[PDB]
Amino acid sequence: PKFIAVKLIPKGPFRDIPRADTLFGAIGNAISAIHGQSAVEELVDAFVGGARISSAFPYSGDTYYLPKPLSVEPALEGILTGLDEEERYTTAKRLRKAKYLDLKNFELALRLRPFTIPEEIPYARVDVPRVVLDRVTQDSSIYFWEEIRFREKSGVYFLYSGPREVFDGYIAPAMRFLGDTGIGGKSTWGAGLFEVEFHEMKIDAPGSEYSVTLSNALPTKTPVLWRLLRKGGWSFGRRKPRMTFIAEGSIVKNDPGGMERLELGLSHEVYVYGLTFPLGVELPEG
């Protein structure tokens, strides 16, 4: 279809690539600041009623990366029939360890075509050491801290399908609030800050009965081929319970997803994002 690719040009390190549960909570806190409580309940009713956002994925200078579908591995020897077996084996193994794909190679793996993995990941996971200095005696106490450090042109982006009146009413004023506060991590050390641009992405996808999830799933029914993701965040200092999501690129069949509202002892109810972002996919026999 036609999606609105919201790009996040970084201005420092991150803490992690944002997922969809920790983008929607950040969009929730951004709307309550500039609009209030009655619009956050309207935001949640817009996602359930209409289109929903996806997880964040890297890019590197007009090479929008997307997750590798899990639809390829039970086909991954039929994908590579026309190869000689001494190089076909190590191609098949590096094809499976791969996490992301290009915007073009994603459209091949949706059709069970031969595809190639990218050569380079647009970021690194460095471990910057900090220190805690005593105020009188200047005594040091090293702890370690890890980050995500992007390259010269690289960044991160997510996708939005939905009505345009919900986008420029809610998603677009929230992403400029979040350009000056963080997306997770030590935002007081300048981590989750960025500059936002809006573009247009178009993905060619085959119409089918199945679909891949470009965000966290929290499924209703049991999916087809999946990969478990287990995380629960924090909400105003309250520790969220861990929830079995499904990682991105996993395969569902006619599943809308669904958010779980939580209590956590706060004044307001906390919604946790688990709507899926379906793109059509072709499967083998299971």
């Binding site: 500039i34 460095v126 910057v128 005593d134």
Partner: protein, 278 residues
């Protein structure tokens, strides 16, 4: 509640070699961006040095500030280091691993302390988030081009240790940034309350004014700091900016002003529209 974000842009001038180590081919390397290889000043080495200077400033003025800032009445000047008991009567009340920091223990007290209202507090059942965001200062476009022109951006300096009797020399090397460099800093204050933000800006400029006469990181007492704040612009970014997106923020103009020609030289003048729109 959110009202706007006072944004502070400018430059950091390393008048003397600045060293912020990493301890990982020079024997003591300054930290570097892993993709470019360029040095930078973190946002966390800048913030903990703005805070360590300001906490000793409050430590001397506990008695004189009992009635402008409450919850400085629960602190005695000094550390809790000898009697190993946290949140005691003395000021530097929280032990982290082996160091003692003033961190207020509750939300109800950190809204009154001048350090923790501006810089944040951890607490138990508290979690007071800070109001400033200190970004990582990177080299200015003029100094990334000197990296393109083949210059050296980080020298390597050799010291020595000499016996007081027999003059046995014992040297070591310390990489440090070439003096004269220009960084680009960014501090984004978060206007939560509309009443006490003048006291939070005037305390942040006091922490910077103490930083221009102390050092930034490194050896410092042997002359490795000597930093200088060169402000460019202050912007307000109102609440009406974030909803409708139209560009009507309030921008102060200070191209060449100091940290002391800005604190009271123009404080009634430069923030004239910001104090009017609130």
């Amino acid at each position: 509640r959110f009202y706007g974000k006072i944004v502070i842009k400018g430059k950091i001038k390393a008048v003397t070699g600045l060293h912020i180590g990493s301890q990982r081919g020079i024997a003591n390397p300054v930290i570097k961006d892993p993709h470019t290889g360029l040095p930078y000043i973190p946002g966390s080495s800048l913030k903990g040095r703005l805070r360590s200077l300001f906490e000793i400033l409050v430590n001397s003025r506990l008695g004189e500030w009992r009635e402008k800032y409450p919850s400085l009445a629960n602190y005695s000047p000094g550390s809790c280091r000898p009697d190993n008991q946290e949140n005691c009567g003395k000021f530097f009340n929280r032990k982290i691993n082996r160091g003692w920091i003033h961190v207020c223990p509750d939300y109800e007290t950190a809204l009154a302390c001048p350090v923790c209202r501006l810089f944040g507090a951890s607490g138990k059942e508290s979690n007071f988030p800070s109001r400033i965001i200190v970004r990582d200062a990177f080299l200015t476009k003029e100094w990334e081009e000197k990296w393109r022109a083949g210059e050296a951006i980080t020298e390597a300096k050799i010291e020595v240790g000499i016996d007081r009797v027999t003059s046995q020399a014992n040297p070591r090397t310390n990489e440090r940034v070439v003096a004269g460099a220009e960084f680009e800093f960014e501090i984004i204050y978060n206007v939560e309350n509309t009443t006490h933000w003048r006291d939070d800006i005037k305390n942040l400029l006091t922490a910077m004014a103490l930083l221009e006469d102390s050092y930034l990181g490194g050896s410092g007492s042997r002359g490795y700091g000597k930093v200088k704040f060169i402000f460019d612009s202050f912007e307000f970014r109102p609440l009406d900016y974030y909803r409708t997106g139209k560009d009507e923020d309030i921008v102060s103009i200070d191209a060449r002003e100091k940290s002391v020609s800005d604190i009271l030289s123009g404080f009634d003048s430069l923030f004239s529209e910001v104090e009017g729109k609130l």
